[PDB]
């Protein structure tokens, strides 16, 4: 896997915020979540809330029956990453108590000035086999790719900030494993 | 082990501090302690005080009979992590002179601007065996999980700051060991 279009983040001239008098624009930087999973079924999510009284907007699937406990841990908030444009990043994480049949990897770097650091190469393979040499097994002859790549924020001329995302490439080798149902 | 609900730290809109005119909120960041232990008995604590004249509040278990020596090292301040909501983080550390039956790992990053960096993955196993291939042995048929994950501070609109914490997942493999006496 790698992030596609990293160089696009060098566009420091498109109505940005001059870092100083006659400065180039402030480049995309700051709070970032890079995450990607390979699964024989949907990624399984646990809900965790920064603020349990946050009202998640109509049209997103969010933790229901939020209690103050939702802010630290509340096992009611289970869900399947089964729909796009659906599950907000900020209230769902891979559920570590499940996902036997998925391999997930992610990193949160927080901070308004965190520099993006995106490596690209076609030479880096990651193995999906577990301690017992078994990879994810594709139930229903389906493979489930999940990903988030919030790269940082774009700072507009006014100072107003927009999250900026990038596509993720996947290439998965698969083989056939005999199974008793 | 991993921290549960890392993405919740991207909630930069909940009455935070605008980093600048039309800025998003300043994200959770700054002084962090991520720590976790697996033990056959309570984690054993040594007291160390930033300021020995600090009066730790009624309802917490703190170093008693504090002297100026308490500020660097004072072997009076021993204790067992045997109670929740009890032992303040800032005046207790694992006692390195005695946790034979525990495996502890922690990191302090200090600084108001330290960016959170939280990795998640279901692929990373940590082995608990010592130099002699023996893991912690569970006295009383009890396993002791200890943890701290102060992620940073939330900066409110006023600038006022609150520590923000997150739950920690544990999954411990155990086996049976023959023992004399």
């Amino acid at each position: 896997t790698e992030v596609i279009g990293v160089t696009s983040l060098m566009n420091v001239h498109s109505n940005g915020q001059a870092t100083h008098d006659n400065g180039a624009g402030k480049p995309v930087q700051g709070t970032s979540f890079h995450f990607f999973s390979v699964g024989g079924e949907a990624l399984e999510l646990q809900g965790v809330l920064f603020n349990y009284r946050t009202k998640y907007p109509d049209g997103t699937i969010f933790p229901k029956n939020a209690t103050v406990q939702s802010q630290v841990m509340n096992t009611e908030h289970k869900a399947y990453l089964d729909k796009n444009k659906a599950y907000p990043v900020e209230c769902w994480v891979p559920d570590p108590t499940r996902n036997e049949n998925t391999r997930y990897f992610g990193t949160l770097t927080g901070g308004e000035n965190v520099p993006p650091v995106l490596h690209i190469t076609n030479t880096a393979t990651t193995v999906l086999l577990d301690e017992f040499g078994v990879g994810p097994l594709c139930k229903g002859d389906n493979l489930y790719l999940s990903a988030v790549d919030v790269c940082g924020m774009f700072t507009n001329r006014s100072g107003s900030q927009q999250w900026r995302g990038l596509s993720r490439y996947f290439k998965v080798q698969l083989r056939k494993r005999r199974v008793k149902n | 082990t991993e921290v549960i609900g890392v993405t919740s730290l991207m909630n930069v809109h909940s009455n935070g501090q605008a980093t600048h005119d039309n800025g998003a909120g300043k994200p959770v960041q700054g002084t962090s302690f991520h720590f976790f232990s697996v033990g056959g008995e309570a984690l054993e604590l040594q007291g160390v005080l930033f300021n020995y004249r600090t009066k730790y509040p009624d309802g917490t278990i703190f170093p008693k009979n504090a002297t100026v020596q308490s500020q660097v090292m004072n072997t009076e301040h021993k204790a067992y992590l045997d109670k929740n909501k009890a032992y303040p983080v800032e005046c207790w550390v694992p006692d390195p002179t005695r946790n034979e039956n525990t495996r502890y790992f922690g990191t302090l990053t200090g600084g108001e601007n330290v960016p959170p960096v939280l990795h998640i993955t279901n692929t990373a196993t940590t082995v608990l065996l010592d130099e002699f291939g023996v893991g912690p042995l569970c006295k009383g048929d009890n396993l002791y999980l200890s943890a701290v994950d102060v992620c940073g501070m939330f900066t409110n609109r006023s600038g006022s700051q609150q520590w923000r914490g997150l739950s920690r997942y544990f999954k411990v493999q155990l086996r049976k060991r023959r023992v004399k006496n």
Partner: antibody, heavy 118, light 110 residues
Framework: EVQLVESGGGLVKPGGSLRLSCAASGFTFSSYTMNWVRQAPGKGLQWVSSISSSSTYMYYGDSVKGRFTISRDNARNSLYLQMNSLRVEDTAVYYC???????????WGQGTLVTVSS | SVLTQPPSASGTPGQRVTISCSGGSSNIGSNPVNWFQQFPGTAPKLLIYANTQRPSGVPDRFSGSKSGTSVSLAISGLQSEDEGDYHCAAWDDSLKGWVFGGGTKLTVLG
């Protein structure tokens, strides 16, 4: 630098019709969402209608839903407002205004007067 | 759904005057406020954009502040040339349209 010029305003009788014209020079007109805003004599401003660069998204104020139609011709560098079923209340100066990203509504035309009277 | 600004305001030359604009989560909460200056019998012109920013041509004197669902415009070093109507504007996500305020006629007492 950037100029917008309205035209087509005049006197028409209630139940009447009228087509307004905005002429854009000074910028790639075809790149920007464009707006109509009107100002009844002595009163403040009131937004009429928006149209996207490619005319994919038109929006109207409740005030004229179903009666007015916004349109643009990107080949003719012109924004239009088709005003049907005109009422006495619709009397105002009709300003033409550009929306740019992050800037919001920035440049206005000189306005053109629409008087709806017997 | 409505932007509320004072129908009138005034000050003495050299003073700082403050015109407020109050909205709700559907408009000013989630969308930026531009201020437009209007002299009688001319068009509105951009004075402040994105709550707090000046286009080229607008003196240092003119400034803004945003606090959640309310914004203010701050005219410092008041002059007679500042006599006119000040309009507040912001997109409303519920009405899918632009909402304006009433307008504020600023009188200068000299």
């Amino acid at each position: 630098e950037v100029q917008l010029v309205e035209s087509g305003g005049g006197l028409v009788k209630p139940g009447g019709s009228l087509r307004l014209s905005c002429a854009a020079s000074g910028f790639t007109f075809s790149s920007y969402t464009m707006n109509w805003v009107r100002q009844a004599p002595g009163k403040g401003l009131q937004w009429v209608s928006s149209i996207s660069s490619s005319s994919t998204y038109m929006y109207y104020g409740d005030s004229v839903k179903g009666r007015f139609t916004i349109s643009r011709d990107n080949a003719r560098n012109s924004l239009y407002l088709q005003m049907n079923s005109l009422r006495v209340e619709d009397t105002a100066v009709y300003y033409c205004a550009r929306y740019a990203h992050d800037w919001n509504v920035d440049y206005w035309g000189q306005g053109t007067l629409v008087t709806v009277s017997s | 759904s409505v932007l509320t600004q004072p129908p009138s305001a005034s000050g003495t030359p050299g003073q700082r005057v403050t015109i407020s604009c109050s909205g709700g989560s559907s408009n000013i909460g989630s969308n930026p406020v531009n201020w437009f200056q209007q002299f009688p019998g001319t068009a509105p012109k951009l004075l402040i954009y994105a709550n707090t920013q000046r286009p080229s041509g607008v003196p240092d004197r003119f400034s803004g502040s945003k606090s959640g669902t309310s914004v203010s415009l701050a005219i410092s070093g008041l002059q007679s040339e500042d006599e006119g109507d000040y309009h507040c504007a912001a997109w409303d996500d519920s009405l899918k349209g632009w909402v304006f305020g009433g307008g504020t006629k600023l009188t200068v007492l000299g």
